[PDB]
Design a protein around this ligand. Structure first.
Ligand SMILES: Nc1ncnc2c1ncn2[C@@H]1O[C@H](COP(=O)(O)OP(=O)(O)OP(=O)(O)O)[C@@H](O)[C@H]1O
Ligand SMILES: [Mg+2]
Ligand SMILES: [Zn+2]
Ligand SMILES: [Zn+2]
Ligand SMILES: [Zn+2]
Lengths: 257, 259, 591
């Protein structure tokens, strides 16, 4: 149910994992809202009209209807996000034989200077101004090579002579992992006017994979919600650069409201 | 006597003490007193003084430096505990002889000089940052954190491959910071061009300064370096134990004289 | 499950010290310090080493001897102390920073025997690398046996688990890193070099790499001199190892009353006589420049630069320059480089450099790729190295346009905002600049305006407080006197100088005078107003016109002259002398 020992460990458990999955799937039908229009049915119909595989979920509704579930969303973002994605995919297939779920309306909004290690590997919403954006980079793959004639695996090598035995063999791929199967990299800095004069505006890097790709333009003030987590980067072993995995994006109309 | 030499620890120490006390240009006692206040525990001695005082002792020192220098160190420490018997020093005095055998014809050097003290004049070409070399490796078990130590494992470190409290499989990893290190600086020094008669191919040598005397010579400095000639094997492949029949040779410096 | 009795005892004693030790007020100071630490961005708590030494000498000795071994346990003790006290976030990194260490070693003295023990060093930052998260306690899962390896600490390298967790399985090669579960900490690689004070003459300085983390990451900016309290450690490099000083705390290197109390009785008496010594101006000028003849005005201006005015920051966050900038445009020879060399030699914190320098920094901060790391690093330039000091730049007329614009920005805003290759920084640089230049064609044409005589851009010229023109007079008496000076110097190898005050005495007097911040009296205010009225009325023809920038330079020089005598208020004497100096420095076209 709840109140385990660690939120990440608690969600990882298969029992509670399927419990939360079933509860969310049921909520995908029960939540007709006071309007009684079956909000989730409306969202499913809108998505399937254009087949956007992009679902919008309001944190307020989850918090009010469930409470505990919305409470656990911040601490275990990836797990519950995958649960919601699979639930939405199953619902869409049932109604219309992957679905990405994007959250919004996060209660607390933190500035770039306001986020620290306490917020690492958690979902958070911030307000920033885009500064630079790249193309739709194909993929970032980390390749680890089993050594040739030596019990050792060469360190991760990013893509997109042994340290001990000095073997000259070409080596063979011990393990290759793919990350960001199709991604766009953007940079967001503190919106002008919120900087404390002398202080240089803070900047952070966000990655938009598959969904939300090319959903922003340089120079656009956006309220970005995403998982602020560490991860590999394009650079001995690869450098671990902190980034924001973008879960949802918005636009602040008129740039001042 | 130590095997394959003409050296007696007691007699050699007594002769060195006599040389320290009975000598005429006594300077050694003067600089011993100077070290008292300075605290600098390094007694530099010109070997030519020993040669003049006792040629036999000079020959013995040159032939077997590694085995003889400790005796001189012990004698100097005993004297320092005799004169100024009360004093404080982090480590007892050390002796660093110099200017003994000017076989500065580096191009003309022979394997007969292996493990023999020699002084050579030349200009240092390159150096390197002080290298910390292990002397007492510290290991901790990944399973039970069983702490253990391996001391002076003849250069390499003997991996236990097995723990001692849980006696699990090879899981005890070395802890660099918890270990103990010593300073070793590498220098590449070129033979002095003037001394070479032909100079068709200027000669170069590699020097190692150990535990002290590090960074005391900047690049391009023309100095006389006195140290022990050394030859060490080179392994054909690090994995295999085979060694080349031809040894690469270097110098373990004992004293520097700026000139 | 092996318990380090030393570590546990140190943890217990450290927690006891935290929860019992109290200030002179009788209250636990560290309780309030931690209460302050609860706020965000405050994850490092400072601790006074002398205080804990008094609380437990044995504990302090053990920590000093085995600081690195016990540091994690000290952090755990801090975590326990803060968690149960107040509403602090359940899980965020905490650290302990140590200070007040009497033992100040030199970079030369850092030997392998000191590895792992706490020590304090003093150096000057040279370059600063970007911040980077780094895994400290990694967590992996074995692919074959799908068991999560946890807390596999890595010693500053990509150290995978030696063998699987399961005794049953022995994959040993296909561990998968759990990024989310892995523990990361933000590290910044800085490079420091021996400060000129400790640097032996003609000896290459020792470059030492240091690692900054937690609150200290951004504390030290490129080009500044700082003292680091930490512990030297070894790091494997592609059994090779290299030294790096992991610094727990970073502080700036080293009031008038404080200095006077610290100053010796004889030194304070000498300084007091100096302050009470009338005509100290010319006396000090002559003492500081023995191997020179004439050019009394140049020496006066250089001395005023050495003293400097009172910097001011407005309520609107605008910084008003407190120090002054001097340029010397001179015919070939004429001792310009000699002036700069004297200034550099006398004054610590003064750095001599030339406009022909080809360093990647290029006389100012730059961004350069590291040869090994290949990551862009902010490298401090000579101008930065002169922070809160003096930069004697020779061949100022020959500077490159890139360095020219950089220097223009530096002298305008007193700070350099450098942004490139994705890196960005704002390096403070409050440095008095003494430039030497030659007239176009070599010889100064006194019938032409200064602009026509030098190639410097208009903004650079405008932002200079004083220009001193050194024309090679054909007068026989002047040449005879110059020959007399040079020949007497070369024959009387020494003792030819007549220093009414010793160089060390001048240095200590300058340090004492710096502590004063002279104010402007209403009488001084109106006198300055009237002097500027006269200067404006002059309106000539002068080489360069007179603007409010000249008024700012005038007030800064008046502040410096007030600082000369250490009087805390301005008097008309200082204002009139400054007016004389600035007006004389103006040269009219002789056509
Ligand atoms: N007015 C002067 N009084 C005394 N000595 C002087 C004077 N002018 C020049 N000298 C002497 O001239 C000698 C040579 O001058 P120096 O090399 O310092 O010139 P410089 O200013 O660097 O010239 P430039 O930059 O135009 O090439 C100096 O040792 C200095 O002693
Ligand atoms: Mg010159
Ligand atoms: Zn290998
Ligand atoms: Zn064990
Ligand atoms: Zn396994």
């Amino acid at each position: 149910d709840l109140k385990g020992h660690s939120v990440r460990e608690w969600v990882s458990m298969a029992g509670p994992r399927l419990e939360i999955h079933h509860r969310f799937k049921n909520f995908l039908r029960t939540h007709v809202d006071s309007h009684g229009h079956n909000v989730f049915k409306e969202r499913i119909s809108d998505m399937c009209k254009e087949n956007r595989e992009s679902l919008v979920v309001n944190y307020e509704d989850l918090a009010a209807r469930e409470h505990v579930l919305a409470y656990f969303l911040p601490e275990a973002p990836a797990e519950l996000l995958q649960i919601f994605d699979e639930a939405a995919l199953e619902v869409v297939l049932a109604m219309y034989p992957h679905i990405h779920v994007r959250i919004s309306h996060l209660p607390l909004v933190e500035e770039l200077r306001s986020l620290r290690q306490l917020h690492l590997n958690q979902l958070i919403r911030t307000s920033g101004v885009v500064t630079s954006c790249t193309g739709v980079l194909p993929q970032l793959s980390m390749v680890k090579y089993n050594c040739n004639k030596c019990n050792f695996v060469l360190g991760p090598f990013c893509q997109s002579s042994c340290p001990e035995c000095q073997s000259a063999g070409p080596f063979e791929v011990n393990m290759e992992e793919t990350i960001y199967q199709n991604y766009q990299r953007i940079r967001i800095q503190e919106s002008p006017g919120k900087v404390a004069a002398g202080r240089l505006p803070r900047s952070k890097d966000a990655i938009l994979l598959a969904d939300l790709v090319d959903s922003c333009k340089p120079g656009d003030e956006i309220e970005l919600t995403g998982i602020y987590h560490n991860n590999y980067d394009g650079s001995g072993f690869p450098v671990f650069a902190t980034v924001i995995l973008a879960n949802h994006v918005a636009k602040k109309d008129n740039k001042v409201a | 006597v130590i095997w394959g030499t003409d050296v007696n620890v007691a007699a050699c120490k007594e002769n060195f003490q006599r040389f320290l006390q009975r000598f005429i240009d006594p300077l050694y006692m003067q600089r011993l007193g100077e070290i008292n206040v300075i605290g600098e525990p390094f007694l530099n001695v010109n070997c030519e003084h020993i040669k003049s005082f006792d040629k036999n002792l000079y020959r013995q020192l040159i032939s077997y430096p590694q085995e003889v220098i400790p005796t001189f160190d012990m004698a100097v420490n005993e004297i320092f505990f005799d004169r100024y018997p009360d004093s404080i020093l982090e480590h007892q005095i050390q002796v660093r002889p110099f200017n003994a055998l000017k076989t500065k014809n580096m191009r003309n050097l022979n394997p007969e000089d292996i493990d023999q003290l020699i002084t050579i004049s030349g200009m240092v070409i390159r150096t390197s940052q002080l290298i910390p070399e292990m002397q007492e490796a510290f290991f901790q078990c990944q399973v039970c954190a069983h702490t253990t130590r391996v001391e002076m494992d003849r250069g390499r470190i003997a991996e236990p491959s097995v723990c001692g409290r849980c006696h699990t499989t090879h899981s005890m990893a070395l802890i660099h910071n918890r270990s103990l290190f010593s300073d070793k600086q590498m220098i590449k020094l070129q033979e002095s061009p003037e001394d070479m008669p032909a100079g068709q191919t200027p000669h170069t040598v590699i020097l190692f300064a150990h535990n002290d005397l590090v960074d005391k010579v900047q690049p391009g400095d023309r100095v006389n370096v006195t140290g022990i000639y050394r030859a060490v094997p080179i392994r054909v492949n690090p994995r295999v134990s085979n060694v080349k029949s031809v040894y690469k040779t270097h110098i373990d410096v004992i004293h520097y004289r700026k000139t | 499950e092996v318990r380090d009795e030393v570590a546990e005892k140190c943890q217990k004693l450290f927690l006891d010290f935290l929860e019992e030790f109290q200030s002179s007020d009788g209250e636990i100071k560290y309780l309030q310090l931690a209460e302050e630490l609860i706020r965000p961005e405050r994850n490092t708590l400072v601790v006074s080493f002398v205080d804990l030494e008094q609380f437990n000498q044995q504990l302090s000795t053990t920590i000093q001897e085995e600081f690195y071994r016990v540091y994690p346990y000290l952090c755990r003790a801090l975590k326990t102390f803060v968690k149960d006290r107040k509403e602090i976030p359940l899980a965020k990194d905490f650290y302990v920073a140590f200070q007040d260490l009497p033992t100040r070693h030199k970079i030369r003295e850092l030997t392998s025997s000191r590895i792992g023990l706490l020590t304090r060093i003093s150096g000057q930052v040279v370059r600063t690398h970007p911040v980077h998260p780094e895994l400290v306690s990694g967590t992996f899962l074995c692919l074959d046996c799908q068991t999560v390896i946890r807390d596999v600490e890595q010693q500053f390298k990509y150290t995978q688990p030696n063998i699987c967790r399961n005794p049953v399985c022995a994959n040993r090669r296909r561990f998968l890193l759990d990024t989310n579960k892995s523990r990361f900490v933000d590290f910044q690689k800085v490079r420091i070099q021996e400060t000129q004070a400790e640097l032996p003459r003609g000896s290459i300085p020792r470059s030492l790499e240091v690692i900054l983390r937690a609150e200290a990451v951004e504390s030290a900016q490129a080009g500044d001199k700082c003292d680091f309290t930490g512990t030297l450690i070894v790091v494997p490099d592609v059994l090779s190892y290299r030294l790096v000083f992991l610094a727990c705390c970073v502080a700036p290197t080293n009031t008038a009353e404080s200095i006077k109390n610290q100053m010796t009785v004889k030194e304070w008496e000498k300084v007091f006589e100096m302050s009470q010594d009338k005509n100290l101006y010319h006396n000090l000028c002559t003492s500081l420049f023995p191997t020179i003849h004439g050019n009394d005005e140049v020496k006066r201006g250089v001395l005023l630069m050495l003293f400097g005015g009172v910097p001011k920051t407005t309520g609107e966050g605008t910084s008003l320059r407190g120090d002054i900038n001097v340029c010397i445009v001179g015919d070939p020879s004429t001792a310009k480089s000699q002036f700069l060399k004297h200034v550099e030699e006398f004054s610590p914190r003064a750095v001599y450099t030339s406009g022909k320098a080809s360093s990647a920094a290029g006389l100012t901060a730059a961004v350069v790729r590291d040869e090994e790391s290949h990551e862009f690093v902010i490298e401090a330039g000579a101008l930065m190295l002169a922070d809160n000091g003096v930069c004697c730049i020779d061949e100022f007329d020959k500077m490159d346009v890139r360095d020219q614009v950089a220097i223009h920005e530096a002298m305008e805003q007193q700070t350099i905002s450098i942004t490139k290759a994705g890196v960005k920084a704002t390096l403070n640089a409050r440095t008095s600049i003494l430039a030497a230049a030659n007239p176009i064609s070599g010889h100064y044409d006194r019938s032409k305006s200064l602009k026509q005589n030098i190639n410097l851009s208009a903004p650079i010229m405008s932002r200079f407080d004083l220009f001193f023109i050194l024309v090679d007079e054909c007068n026989e008496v002047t040449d005879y006197a110059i020959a007399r000076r040079i020949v007497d110097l070369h024959s009387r190898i020494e003792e030819s100088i007549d220093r009414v005050y010793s160089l060390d005495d001048i240095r200590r007097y300058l340090l004492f005078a710096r502590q004063f911040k002279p104010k402007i009296s209403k009488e001084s205010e109106d006198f300055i107003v009237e002097q500027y009225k006269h200067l404006r009325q002059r309106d000539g023809k002068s080489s360069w016109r007179i603007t409010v920038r000249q008024l700012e330079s005038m007030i800064r020089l008046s502040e410096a002259m007030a600082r000369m005598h250490c009087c805390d208020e301005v008097q008309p004497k200082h204002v009139k002398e400054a007016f004389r100096l600035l007006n004389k420095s103006i040269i009219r076209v002789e056509t």
